[PDB]
Design a protein around this nucleic acid. Structure first.
Lengths: 128, 109, 102, 84, 60, 147
RNA sequence: UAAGUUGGGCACUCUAAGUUGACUGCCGGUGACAAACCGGAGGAAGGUGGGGAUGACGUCAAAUCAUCAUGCCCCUUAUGAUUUGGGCUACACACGUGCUACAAUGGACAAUACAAAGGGCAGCGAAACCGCGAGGUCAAGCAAAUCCCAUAAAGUUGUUCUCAGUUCGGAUUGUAGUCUGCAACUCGACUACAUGAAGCUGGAAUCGCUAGUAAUCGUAGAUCAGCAUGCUACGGUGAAUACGU
């Protein structure tokens, strides 16, 4: 067969996408998506790239991912999805870029500076 | 009265009904529960008489009584007896080590 | 993995000096031999030292330092007393931290 | 808090051994910080140097919860106006 | 006074650690790093001279 | 200054829930809020049999203020029509605030009681709407010839 | 194969060097045709992208003679010097700063997935065994992308608790123990047992915060014979609103 591979980066995490057309089924790290996301019922947001792009679908997916919390990496899949769907055909880019899902976010945490401490709280003043 | 020692609330689970008695907190309670083969069971007093006898006889294994209070009073009494510095600091909310009393007036006095 | 090999590790505090030294050593190594391993980078450990811009009070105005540390790895296969000299002869400039091994 | 063992000042030992085999004394000069009371320390009048003047304290049998470490505090009334 | 403590931290000691690590030039013992054995202010100031290998830029 | 909405929360398929859950997540724990909101929305369907959509929509309809006041300057206060975004924000805000003030011991039953009693045009959220609509649109005399 | 552990592989990720890239750059409109403004495309990133480093002449005769240097003045058989112990930690209270609670988005138990950064030579202490436990024996590996710190935690699946000063809270005290140091008595830290306080969201007044922020959860480092609710740093999770001046 044929396989399309594009990376996904978000929130100090890394995604190695393996996209192969099919009936549609994902097993992240040889483990199903429901077996990897707490709780969670937000995988339909991960299916939005399949709902607006390649309507309705679907393609089988295998992925290996490590680093960062579950939200940042469960959201890193979509940019690899978009890259692979653009690699498949440039037609899908017009529907992708009007909604995003390809532009990898450039926003992460910030350093820390005097005023913050063990918890991310600013200091007070001397009243009275 | 009623099931062991004194002060046992009716219709309550054993793990917490065995605490009000002065001398057991939360660990040795479960230890003697494993000794006596009993259960909370959930939350109500299911303790039948055949096991009342066994638990009432097992409870003697520890020094659980007002005798613990008596021992504490004689301990502090002797510790203050030899004009002991530690006896002086027993009135200041000051343990055998020290507590750096500047605000240590609220909890103690 | 078992094989004949010469392995070296490089340390300096300037990426330009360390990579130019690595380049010249690779040149000399493949000059008197072959199949040399390139200047493989390494996560280049850093440092940090928090210090207060102050003399007597005012810890609020803190300021930071670091000591960046480049590390470089080169491997050589099929040794010879020629690659030995190519390693132990020329390390200039002498800010770099070379340790010849096998 | 030492399980390694007790830690009586050897120096106090050397003096008290001769002090105890024959007749004891009712006054002793020492520093008595790196030692403690043991069964063989009974019947003496040691003096922990509180910092200003060492005060002789007579050994009794009953001081096992208490020790030689300290008996005459340096705070010494109080430091404060009020009382406990 | 500081002058005799230079000798104090130099002379032998009754046992293992009755010592403290102070800066050789600056007499301030507080806020010193064992990596360099210089105090707070002196090592900050020598960093600006560009003598000790490493950097002061920060922003990392 | 814009809003930056949140789009999908197909649990259950709807949009107001997506904004709602983001208020209950005290100290940033979204799963607990999602679970309890799901349990409560299944409960409100269980008791007093109906669909969650009808009860929720008509409940937030009975508790959405349409007129509101704002103060400025002596002491005067201009009644102001509320933007639909701020309308729903205030509705959900006061709904959750009075569900908290209800004070029940259950994960879900307090919210079910709140929304289903609002479905009866009664309740503390309805009380707040009535109080605001009584103080407002009765003193619209002075600041009506203004913004 | 327990395993990327090894044969190989460098496609991917990653790692660090160099460049490419975002500079009103292009178009349309506005605008004294200009500056500039608005929208649109493109792009990963459009109007100093996000952040940090950098703080003008000068003001507060701001702080420091206790880092240091130093004018002037003062001490010297002592205003200098050594040692042991005490003390910087006291205690009617006031204030500041912060930590933990006053619990059903919760309490306890059981199972279970997901980080980054940093440190380590005479240091990191792996496995194993012992012990309820702090810890003890042991000795592999480790000058470091190799081995260790180091299970990440919150979190998810379950059971139970069912509104009480509560299996709430964990303050106080005593006992028995663990490690350091010669010595944990004034003054180290830690575990187990025993008690289970005030406290059921807080007044006048008041502080911080415009998006990865707050709120919230953990982690490491420095200093360090042993001792950090503090500091620095790192990651996890994570929104409400900004009508308008």
């Amino acid at each position: 067969q044929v396989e399309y591979r594009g990376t996904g980066r978000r929130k100090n995490s890394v995604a190695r996408v393996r996209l192969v057309p099919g009936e549609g089924n994902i097993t992240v790290n040889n483990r199903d998506v429901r077996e990897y996301l707490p709780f969670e019922s937000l995988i339909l947001d991960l299916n939005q790239p399949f709902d607006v792009t390649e309507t309705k679908g679907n393609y089988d997916v295998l992925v290996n991912v490590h680093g960062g919390g579950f939200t940042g990496q469960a959201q890193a899949i979509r940019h690899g999805i978009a890259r692979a769907l653009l690699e498949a055909d440039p037609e899908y880019r017009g529907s992708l870029k009007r909604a995003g899902l390809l532009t990898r976010d450039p926003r992460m945490k910030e350093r820390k500076k005097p005023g913050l401490k063990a918890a991310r709280r600013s200091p007070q003043f001397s009243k009275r | 009265a009623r099931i062991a020692g004194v002060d046992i609330p009716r219709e309550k689970r054993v793990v917490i009904s065995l605490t009000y008695i002065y001398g057991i907190g939360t660990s040795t309670a479960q230890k003697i529960l494993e000794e006596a083969n009993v259960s909370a069971d959930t939350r109500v007093k299911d303790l039948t008489d055949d096991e009342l006898g066994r638990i009432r006889e097992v409870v003697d294994g520890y020094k659980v009584e007002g005798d613990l209070r008596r021992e504490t009073n004689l301990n502090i009494k002797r510790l203050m007896e030899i004009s002991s510095y530690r006896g002086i600091r027993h009135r200041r909310g000051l343990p055998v080590r020290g507590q750096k009393t500047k605000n240590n007036a609220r909890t103690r006095k | 993995m078992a094989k004949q090999k010469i392995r070296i590790r490089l340390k300096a505090y300037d990426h330009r000096v360390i990579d130019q030294s690595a380049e010249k050593i690779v040149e000399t190594a493949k000059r008197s031999g072959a199949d040399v391993s390139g200047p493989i980078p390494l996560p280049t450990e850093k440092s940090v030292y928090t210090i207060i811009r102050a003399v007597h009070m005012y810890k609020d105005s803190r300021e930071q330092f670091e000591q960046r540390t480049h590390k470089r790895l080169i491997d050589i296969v099929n040794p010879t007393p020629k690659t030995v000299d190519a390693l132990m002869g020329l390390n200039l400039p002498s800010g770099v931290d070379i340790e010849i091994k096998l | 808090s030492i399980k390694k063992g007790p830690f009586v000042d050897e120096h106090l030992m050397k003096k008290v051994e001769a002090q105890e085999g024959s007749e004891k004394k009712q006054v002793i000069k020492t520093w008595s910080r790196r030692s403690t009371i043991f069964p063989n320390f009974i019947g003496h009048t040691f003096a922990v140097y509180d910092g200003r003047k060492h005060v002789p304290v007579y050994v009794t049998e009953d001081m096992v919860g208490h020790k030689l470490g300290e008996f005459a505090p340096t705070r010494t009334f109080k430091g404060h106006v009020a009382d406990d | 006074a500081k002058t005799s403590m230079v000798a104090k931290q130099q002379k032998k000691q009754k046992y293992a650690v009755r010592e403290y690590t102070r800066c050789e030039r600056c007499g301030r013992p507080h806020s010193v790093y064992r990596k360099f054995k210089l105090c707070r202010i002196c090592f900050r100031e020598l960093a600006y001279k560009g003598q000790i290998p490493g950097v002061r830029k920060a922003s990392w | 200054v814009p809003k930056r909405d949140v789009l999908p929360d197909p649990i259950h398929n709807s949009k107001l829930v997506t904004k709602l859950i983001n208020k209950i997540m005290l100290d940033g724990k979204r799963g607990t809020a999602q679970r309890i909101l799901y349990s409560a929305f299944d409960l409100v369907e269980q008791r007093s049999g109906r669909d969650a959509l009808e009860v929720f929509e008509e409940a937030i309809n009975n508790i959405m203020p349409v007129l509101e006041v704002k103060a400025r300057r002596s002491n005067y206060q201009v009644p102001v029509e509320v933007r639909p975004e701020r309308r729903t924000t205030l509705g959900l805000r006061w709904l959750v605030n009075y569900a908290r003030l209800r004070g029940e011991k259950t994960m879900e039953d307090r919210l079910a009681n709140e929304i289903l009693d609002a479905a009866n045009n009664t309740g503390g959220a309805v009380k707040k709407r009535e109080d605001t609509h009584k103080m407002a649109e009765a003193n619209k005399a002075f600041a009506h010839y203004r913004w």
